[PDB]
Amino acid sequence: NLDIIGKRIEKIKQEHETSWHYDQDHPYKTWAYHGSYETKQTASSMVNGVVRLLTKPWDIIPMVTQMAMTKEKVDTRTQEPKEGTKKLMKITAEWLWKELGKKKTPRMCTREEFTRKVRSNAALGAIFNKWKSAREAVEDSGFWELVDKERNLHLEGKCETCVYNMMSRAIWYMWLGARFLEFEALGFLNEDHWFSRENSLSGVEGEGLHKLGYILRDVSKKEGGAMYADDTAGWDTRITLEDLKNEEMVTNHMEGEHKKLAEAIFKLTYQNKVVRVQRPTTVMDIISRRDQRGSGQVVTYGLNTFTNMEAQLIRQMEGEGVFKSIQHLTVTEEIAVKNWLVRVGRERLSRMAISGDDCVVKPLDDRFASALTALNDMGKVRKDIQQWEPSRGWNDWTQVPFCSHHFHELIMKDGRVLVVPCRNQDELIGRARISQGAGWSLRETACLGKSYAQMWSLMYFHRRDLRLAANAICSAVPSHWVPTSRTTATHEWMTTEDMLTVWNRVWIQENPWMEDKTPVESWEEIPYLGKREDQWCGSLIGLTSRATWAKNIQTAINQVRSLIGNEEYTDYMPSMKRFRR
Ligand SMILES: CCC(=O)NCc1nnc2n1CCCC2
Ligand SMILES: [Zn+2]
Ligand SMILES: [Zn+2]
């Protein structure tokens, strides 16, 4: 307790000595409260005018328009798992780190790699003070002396400045220094692709939205039961102290400085936390707790993937009868569990697609559906179903939800097969109409519209309305202006290369599921969903509003071109049959 967190609390207390007071009307029950102090401040979603002016029919669709308008799960407790459950988790975690470590070497990430990340806008979840932005702190030796002070404090097993700032979500921003030390010790999990499909068998890290459907269809080819895709209620809030201890076992594979720097991240920042939260009653509360997930988002993704892979192997073990009860594992069940892992563990990992808290599992048979005792006792309670009601599985891989999508099998006029990503079109148009942050020039807004358009041309070309709207936006933005994002899966649409050339590289040349590498010569060779299927997935094809928009699209394009000014533009609309004379 206070021996590990006191120094951080001590230090904050003294910076606000004028305002320190143990408030008695504090709303916390499961967080340890320490004190309050005086502050006064808060970032709403802004509309992208370029995308909205080129999507006029959606101006009267509430599911689109409402998306641009506008903490009692975080303050709850998880119970300690039973002895049998704790044993299953420890054995599985030990085995899984070894498998992930067979073809990989843990190593520290560098000031250089960090500096390079900050000098190309990656969402590192830092705060604004002594320097303005991340870019300036990184180009100043004073910062690195603060980093050095904390670094030597961590080697000594102590912490002074690694404090979270809070803001079914919750983001835990830290100062750039604490983010660096996290990246130095644990960045290797992401930087060296520990959760690639080649390395982890269940994982999809780095795979890309154009691969995920082919991956689900490959899982579907295994003999076994339904495909299960159960969502956890508030995954980050159900991470137990036993989970954080199994995750820390990655340090058993390290040596030297690295092993000590990693052990300190887990001990001092993950298994003990100090957090500052804004309460309108506007004060700042300094609260602490031992469990739950609260790391950088990239480390969070890898450890969520690890603990989810572990949890789902155990649910598979329960379905297969490898153990009888979570109350207690007998000596001979331990050897049975170890022996299952060695004998079939790698086959069972290949039956899964796991993206952090998101999973799809094709178990050996449907006993999995009612195998709930370990899952519930680990705290991974399913969303939108009663605790002991059996899971409903999916009979067709094309119906399974994964990473906010479903996937269609689409047959090209020439016989070849595309497996394409899809989701309700209102969600796609509603997201592309939104920007985050202040000070957007018209050029920067246009280049963000262009990024959405090129993503649509690469991933959603099969949706009639999105191929047309993508062509219109790319026609309305100057041809040489470079697509941008402020927050940055593989992003092959982020390029000034011709989108037909990129489509050929992604869907034909580099597609390991496409045997015939004959390039496509025009967009007209690239198919759409059935018209009825496109309507089912939210198309406006068939509406009078949509017909007028498609017919008059050159008028909309010219409206945006007149706003941007006398720049060099390309007409991409004749790449479509209906605008081709
Ligand atoms: C009508 C929309 C367009 O193509 N761009 C607007 C625009 N702004 N100055 C000029 N133009 C076009 C060419 C003449 C000079
Ligand atoms: Zn620290
Ligand atoms: Zn669809």
Q: Which of 442, 475, 558, 562 to mutate to test the pocket of ligand 1 (most atoms within 8 A of CB)?
A: 562
Q: Confirm or reject: Cβ of 558 under 6 Å from ligand 1.
A: yes
- Rounded distance, CA 417 to CA 137, Å? 50
- Rounded distance, CA 398 to CA 418, Å? 13
Pairing of strands 172-173, 273-279: unpaired
Cite the DSSP H helix spans in 102-140.
Answer: 111-118, 134-138
Going from the Cα of 172 to the center of ligand 2, the distance in angstroms, rounded, reads 15
- Rounded distance, CA 434 to CA 65, Å? 10
Q: How far is CA 93 from its chain centroid?
A: 22
Q: How far is CA 526 from its chain centroid?
A: 30
- Rounded distance, CA 355 to CA 148, Å? 34
Q: 537 a known binding residue? A: yes
For ligand 1, atom 1, the nearest C-alpha belongs to 558
Cite the DSSP H helix spans in 358-487.
Answer: 373-377, 425-432, 442-459, 464-476
Q: 194 near 200, Cβ under 8 Å?
A: yes
Going from the Cα of 423 to the center of ligand 3, the distance in angstroms, rounded, reads 5
Q: 304 a known binding residue? A: yes
Q: Residue for token digits 């991933």?
A: 459
Which of 282, 258, 324 has its CA nearest to residue 88?
324
Q: 53 near 76, Cβ under 8 Å?
A: no
- Rounded distance, CA 138 to CA 152, Å? 19
Q: 232 a known binding residue? A: yes
Going from the Cα of 481 to the center of ligand 3, the distance in angstroms, rounded, reads 31
Q: 406 a known binding residue? A: yes
Question: Cα 525–529–534 angle (5° rounding)?
Answer: 140
> Which tokens go with 213?
């459907």
Q: 231 near 372, Cβ under 8 Å?
A: no
- 343 burial via Cβ count (<10 Å: 0-12, 13-18, 19+): exposed
Q: Confirm or reject: Cβ of 568 under 6 Å from ligand 1.
A: no
> Which tokens go with 209?
């939205």
With both helix axes pointing from N to C terminus, report the angle between 331-349 and 83-101 in degrees, rounded to the nearest 10.
40
* CB half-sphere exposure, 227, CA atoms < 13 A: 24
> Which tokens go with 359?
């999973």
Going from the Cα of 457 to the center of ligand 1, the distance in angstroms, rounded, reads 26
Residue 569's alpha-carbon distances to 440, 471, 560, in angstroms, are 21, 12, 11
Q: 231 a known binding residue? A: yes
Q: What is the fold of 1-38+110-186+240-291? A: Alpha-Beta Plaits (3.30.70)
Question: Cα 315–245–339 angle (5° rounding)?
Answer: 45
Instruction: Tell me the DSSP string of 153-217.
Output: HHHTT--SS--EEE-----EE--HHHHHHHHHHHTHHHHTTTTSHHHHSSB-TT--HHHHHHHHH
Q: How far is CA 247 from its chain centroid?
A: 19
Q: Confirm or reject: Cβ of 129 under 6 Å from ligand 1.
A: no
Task: Tell me, letter by letter, the H, E, C secondary structure of 35-69.
Answer: EEEECCCCCCCEECHHHHHCCHHHHHCHHHHHHHC
Q: Confirm or reject: Cβ of 559 under 6 Å from ligand 1.
A: no
For ligand 1, atom 6, the nearest C-alpha belongs to 562
Q: Confirm or reject: Cβ of 565 under 6 Å from ligand 1.
A: yes
Instruction: Return the domain boundaries, the chain.
Output: 1-38+110-186+240-291, 402-579
Instruction: Starting from the CA of residue 158, give the closest ligand.
Output: 2
Instruction: Tell me the DSSP string of 308-361.
Output: HHHHHHHHHHHHTTS-S-SS---HHHHHHHHHHHHHHHHHHHTTEEEETTEEEE
Residue type, 350: S
- Give the CA-trace dihedral at 488, 493, 497, 499, to 10 degrees: -170
Which of 478, 454, 556 has its CA nearest to residue 52?
556
- Rounded distance, CA 492 to CA 421, Å? 15
Which of 571, 567, 563 has its CA nearest to residue 442?
563
Going from the Cα of 11 to the center of ligand 3, the distance in angstroms, rounded, reads 53
Pairing of strands 46-47, 406-411: unpaired
Q: Confirm or reject: Cβ of 566 under 6 Å from ligand 1.
A: yes
Residue type, 440: W
Residue type, 106: P
Residue 218's alpha-carbon distances to 177, 215, 350, in angstroms, are 43, 5, 9
Q: Which of 50, 442, 561 to mutate to test the pocket of ligand 1 (most atoms within 8 A of CB)?
A: 561
Question: Cα 150–153–157 angle (5° rounding)?
Answer: 135
Cite the DSSP H helix spans in 477-552.
Answer: 499-504, 531-536, 544-551
Query: What atom in ligand 1 is closest to the CA of residue 565?
Result: 8
For ligand 1, atom 10, the nearest C-alpha belongs to 566
Pairing of strands 273-279, 283-289: antiparallel
Instruction: Starting from the CA of residue 428, give the closest ligand.
Output: 3
Q: 340 near 327, Cβ under 8 Å?
A: no
Instruction: Report DSSP state, residue 506.
Output: I
